Structure 1
């Protein structure tokens, strides 16, 4: 388990034609100097800390 910690840095919007999904840019705290955008399930605000379970990969639009 190479778990990965990333700090939500920006609220970008809700995707999914439903809407329950927030597009979010996060910053790792285990070595920053790179940010990346992830899709959430639950209610999120700035400074939250997602458990990125695959350090690298990212989504865009949902349907």
Structure 2
């Protein structure tokens, strides 16, 4: 049960070394439930990156 979420806004670089990015995701189906999540690789807007689990927000990393 994986869910796909298009990214709509790149918030900024987070994490200690800056290797992880805060991003604003929007679900492909049910275009609502917008969530803030962290991503490892390089990210542009309009990336369809899929989420193994959806019911979790994200905050700054230490």
Shift of 1:33: 2.1
Unpaired segments ≥5 residues, structure 1: none
Shift of 1:10: 0.1
Moved beyond 3 Å, runs of 4+: none
Residue deviations 1:10-46, cap 9 Å, x none?
0100111100100001000121122101000100010
1:24 corresponds to? 23
Shift of 1:58: 1.6
CA distance in 1, matches of 2:41, 2:59: 17
CA RMSD of superposed structures (Å) = 0.8
**TM-score (ref. length: structure 1):** 0.92
**TM-score (ref. length: structure 2):** 0.93
Unpaired segments ≥5 residues, structure 2: none
Shift of 1:55: 1.3
